[PDB]
């Protein structure tokens, strides 16, 4: 009876989110109640996804990462308490009434990259980056969320499960079945998110894994063995027809030179060569003018 449920926010396949108040600080919070699921998963105890989110968010503290305020339950039921976020980036993108100026795009990129840099310094991969996982508060602060797929990286012999992001933002090494990877997967997702911000529509909207690979290669060209040295050794590799690709200044006609360099860095086929969050933050595009807009001035749907 600590929380007074007062609104229904949404229901997913694996959880249900409500609005509530703490009754002690009168703070508005979001409660994510985790579903038991099927009869078999109910007998296995508390959901592994909830345990993953709890164990990862208890060890992280950054302005641009969602904060876990509390967690309770009864028997195998469990509820996670988060700070309430007004909206997310997907709602901003699909809202035709608001204009995304270059400064807004730079600000949204900056907050995402700083959160990602803090996350990667602690040897954690988000693995589920997409516009609806970047939540916006009333003060225009972006936070990464939905840590149900996040996992620590760095220790060898830790292939583990094959869970991957939705295919529109999956990196080509993931689409080829790579089990061991680094920060490149999140960086490719970040490039896809930036492309979505620039075009206001999904950049590579494939309807299947093979269709996603086909779209990647038609838009950015089929990579050779010089660009991706050991690409043919991935478990789910298939040879493709060679595509010239489209020059990036044609796809993003309004993009300047610095933004173009950032995009090429984010969309490199070699996972090792792909820029990291620190390298991306040091890129000249962020230090150039105009600067990112203050969070209080960011567009609100």
């Amino acid at each position: 009876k600590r929380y007074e449920k007062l609104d229904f926010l949404g229901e997913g396949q694996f959880a249900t989110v409500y609005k509530a108040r703490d009754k002690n600080t009168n703070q508005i919070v979001a409660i994510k109640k985790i579903k038991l699921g099927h009869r078999s998963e109910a007998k296995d105890g508390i959901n592994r996804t909830a345990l993953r989110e709890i164990k990862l968010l208890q060890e992280l503290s950054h302005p641009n990462i969602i904060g876990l305020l509390d967690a309770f339950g009864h028997k195998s039921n469990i509820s996670l308490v988060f700070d309430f976020m007004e909206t997310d980036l997907e709602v901003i993108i699909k809202d035709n009434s608001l204009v995304l100026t270059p400064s807004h795009i730079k600000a949204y990129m900056l907050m995402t990259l700083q959160g990602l840099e803090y996350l990667h310094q602690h040897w954690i991969l988000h693995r589920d980056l997409k516009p609806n996982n970047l939540l916006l508060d009333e003060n225009g602060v972006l936070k990464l969320a939905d840590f149900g797929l996040a996992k620590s990286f760095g220790s060898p012999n830790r292939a583990y499960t094959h869970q991957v992001v939705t295919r529109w933002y999956r990196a080509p090494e993931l689409l080829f079945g790579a089990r061991m990877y680094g920060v490149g997967v999140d960086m490719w997702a970040v490039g896809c998110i930036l492309a979505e911000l620039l075009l206001r529509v999904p950049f590579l909207p494939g309807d299947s894994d093979l269709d996603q690979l086909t779209r990647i290669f038609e838009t950015l060209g089929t990579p050779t063995e010089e660009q991706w040295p050991d690409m043919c050794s991935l478990p789910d590799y298939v040879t493709f027809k060679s595509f010239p690709g489209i020059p990036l200044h044609h796809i993003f006609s309004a993009a300047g030179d610095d933004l173009l360099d950032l995009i090429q860095g984010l969309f490199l086929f070699n996972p090792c060569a792909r820029i990291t969050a620190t390298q991306a933050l040091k890129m000249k595009y962020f230090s150039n003018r105009p600067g990112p807009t203050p969070g209080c001035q960011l567009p609100r749907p």
Partner: protein, 65 residues
């Protein structure tokens, strides 16, 4: 107000850990398992494993409760 990159500073309470790119040149990578070509195709290098092991070895080495 232009943005300027400021490095992320976290206190580790331990000896300085060498930078990731320097590991091979300083000879650290001669004492870790090499990364297979399949591992390399995904972006996983031996430098990451060595860096993680060293950071854990030096984390909080001299910190008092």
């Amino acid at each position: 107000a232009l943005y300027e990159y400021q490095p992320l500073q976290i206190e580790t309470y331990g000896p300085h850990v060498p930078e990731l790119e320097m590991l091979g040149r300083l000879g650290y990578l001669n004492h870790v398992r090499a990364a297979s070509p399949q591992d390399l195709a995904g972006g996983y290098t031996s430098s990451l494993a060595c860096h993680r092991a060293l950071q854990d070895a030096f984390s909080g080495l001299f910190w008092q409760p």
